[PDB]
């Protein structure tokens, strides 16, 4: 079936996009940590 | 059906966008980490 090949296909893509979103959200949290470290260091070193 | 034909390329188009965005974001994150390494040297 072509209909089944397209849906298996959609499910895979949706899953991968959701995984990317989770990954990127975690990166954003990590980035906030990096930015805080940079700010602290910049005032420490002047 | 055609609602899923649309849903499919919508999903695949978005996926390719994630790949492009990710490599851009990784250059950005490496830059922040490099800046921290430099600041720690002081």
């Amino acid at each position: 079936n072509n209909i089944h090949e397209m849906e298996i296909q959609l499910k895979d893509a949706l899953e991968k996009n959701q995984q990317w979103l989770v990954y990127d959200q975690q990166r954003e949290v990590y980035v906030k940590g990096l930015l805080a470290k940079i700010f602290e260091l910049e005032k420490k070193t002047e | 059906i055609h609602e899923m034909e649309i849903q499919l390329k919508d999903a695949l188009e978005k996926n390719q966008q994630w790949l492009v965005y990710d490599q851009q974001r990784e250059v950005y994150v490496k830059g922040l980490l490099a800046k921290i390494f430099e600041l720690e040297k002081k």
Binding site: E15, Y23, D24, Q26, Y30 | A11, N15
Partner: peptide
């Protein structure tokens, strides 16, 4: 053709 992230969790999270 569709690809997911390098890891399921972002390194450092």
């Amino acid at each position: 053709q569709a690809q997911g992230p390098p890891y399921p969790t972002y390194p450092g999270y």
